[PDB]
Amino acid sequence: AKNKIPNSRLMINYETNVDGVLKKKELPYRVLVVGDLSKGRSVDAKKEFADREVRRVNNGVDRVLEEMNISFDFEAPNFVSKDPSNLKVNYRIESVKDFRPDAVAKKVPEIRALLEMKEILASFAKDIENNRNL
């Protein structure tokens, strides 16, 4: 209250106010990198250069990537499935291990058809049935 309490004969108050100049936390040595990553295929890449929010990679290159919608619909020679039409690789990059010749066969729908058989066909127990023993 600004009106202020009436002063007694022995007014004790206890000062709790402290002045001083606030501190400043250190600056992380930032490193900017500039290169054609998306080739023109990302949320921040498809936008005009006047407004491209720079990333940070707080987490890692695995998640800062997935943050960008990096997909691609490029054609490729077909050697799987029936009917015409060249194989159309179409899936968005999540991690950096996506270019691994393995995560590809898991992503591309057509190739996965052959990998699906290798789970069932190759798992034929011709060792449990052949091993009859009376």
């Binding site: 100049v21 400043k24 250190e26 600056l27 992380p28 040595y29 930032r30 490193v31 900017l32 990198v33 500039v34 290169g35 054609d36 990553l37 998306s38 080739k39 023109g40 990302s42 921040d44 890449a45 250069f49 006047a50 491209r52 720079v54 990333r55 940070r56 990679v57 707080n58 890692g60 290159v61 800062v64 990537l65 960008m68 691609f72 490029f74 490729a76 020679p77 050697f79 799987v80 194989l87 690789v89 990059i93 950096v96 270019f99 691994r100 010749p101 393995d102 590809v104 066969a105 898991k106 591309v108 190739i111 052959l114 990998l115 058989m117 290798k118 789970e119 066909l121 190759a122 798992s123």
Partner: protein
């Protein structure tokens, strides 16, 4: 026989262009953000070279209006609460073209002001050769640049902005091609895939510019030390341990393939430093590297007066302009706090000196690291008020960094005059 398909199906798109273009442009991104230090936050900005080519070439004579310049200088470095950048990294390869020369002229125009040494790489098209390995055949690049083909380039080396550009030579192998016995594709828990080959032979299976490891050492030379003395030489900075080599069985017995694009000799390490290039030289077989030279593209000159000659030798040196830059990030950053406080010529010389004082010595500490804490040797700071403007000042510092080793000649000889007691007449 389903393996025969997959070994053809997948191998059709891994070898495909565009697909492996993203690989190159992400593998070398992962390479930078692999270390992860205590206080070194990297950051990305995916932009096509053309989208910047058009930018600087349109605003070369009006850089303050450049869109990029407005996303590094006046955006984070200039503004109050903004966090400034430090040492940009150009993931591109620059030729001797009269277009790509502007690209550097512009980016350097920014770096110069934003105080952020722009590191990049140069294509094999620079030396006018279609295979970078064939640069070893050139005797001395010093005599090369005298050729009138580099006229445009020699003009750029004279610009002030070039003292912030730092171009690297050589490209490290960033991925080992896929063999079953070597670097097997990690298949799934049932889908047999590890039996899977690729298709390469001579020299065409993914590369990445040395500039990465260069910057990825500047980061290292910050978490450990604090300044940028720790990015040169073997014992000191650039060592780059454990690179992705390659091995292959053509007919012999797994003949290893050196991780580096080119096996620079000794006088190559030097004969490049004079051109204003940063060679990424390899130790034969050791599967490692090191940066001996870290020079900017600035001309070294020569001069008659000894002092002047030494000036130009230190200015061309990138590692110092990295450090001197860190003082700018101190002034335009910290003194902003006391912008309204009543201060004097004798007070600003206090605040600015009391800081830098903890980083200047003459005595040498054991080991390189324990001494690289101290970049500078000695500093002067003569600020002084100007007439007219009462609250304004004008500083003028001058720093002499700890001069690095760079080489030496030596003449051995049998004197037989040192100990005359054995060869003298009197006996």
């Amino acid at each position: 026989v389903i393996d025969k398909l997959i070994d053809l199906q997948v191998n059709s798109i891994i070898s495909n262009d565009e697909f492996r273009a993203l690989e190159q442009e992400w593998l070398k991104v992962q390479e930078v953000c692999q270390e992860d230090y205590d206080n070194v936050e990297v950051s990305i900005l995916d932009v096509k070279k053309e989208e910047l080519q058009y930018d600087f070439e349109r605003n070369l004579y009006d850089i303050s209006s450049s869109d990029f310049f407005k996303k590094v200088y006046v955006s984070e470095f200039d503004q109050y609460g903004g966090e400034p950048y430090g040492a940009i990294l150009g993931l591109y390869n620059f030729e001797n073209t009269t277009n790509d020369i502007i690209w550097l002229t512009g980016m350097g125009m920014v770096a110069k002001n934003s105080h952020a040494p722009f590191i990049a790489s140069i294509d094999k098209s620079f030396f006018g050769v279609k295979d970078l390995s064939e640069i070893t055949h050139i005797k001395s690049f010093e005599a090369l640049l005298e050729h009138p083909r580099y006229k445009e380039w020699n003009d750029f080396r004279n610009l002030d902005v070039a003292a912030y550009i730092g171009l690297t030579v050589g490209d490290f192998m960033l991925r080992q091609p896929y063999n079953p016995e070597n670097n097997p594709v990690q298949y799934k828990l049932m889908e047999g895939f590890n039996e899977f080959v690729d298709y390469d032979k001579n020299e065409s299976y993914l590369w990445g510019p040395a500039s990465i490891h260069l910057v990825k050492n500047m980061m290292r030379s910050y978490d450990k030390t604090r300044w940028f003395q720790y990015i040169r030489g073997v014992e000191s900075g650039g060592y780059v341990k454990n690179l992705v080599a390659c091995v292959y069985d053509n007919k012999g017995i797994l003949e290893t393939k050196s991780p580096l694009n080119v096996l620079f000799a000794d006088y190559m390490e030097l004969s490049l430093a004079n051109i204003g290039l940063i060679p990424f030289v390899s130790e034969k077989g050791t599967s490692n590297a090191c940066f001996f030279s870290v020079n900017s593209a600035k001309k070294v000159e020569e001069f008659v007066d000894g002092f002047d000659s030494a000036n130009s030798r230190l200015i061309a040196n990138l590692s110092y302009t990295m450090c001197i830059s860190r003082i700018s990030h101190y002034i335009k950053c910290v003194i902003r706090d006391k912008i309204g406080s009543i201060v004097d010529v004798e007070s600003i010389q206090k605040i600015l000196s009391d800081w830098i004082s903890e980083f200047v010595t003459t005595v040498y500490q054991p080991t390189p690291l324990e001494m690289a804490r101290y970049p500078f040797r000695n500093v002067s700071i003569e600020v002084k008020t100007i007439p007219g403007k009462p609250g304004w000042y004008s500083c003028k510092i001058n720093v002499i960094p700890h001069i690095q080793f760079e080489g030496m000649n030596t003449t051995m000889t049998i004197d037989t005059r040192l100990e005359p007691e054995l060869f003298g007449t009197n006996n």
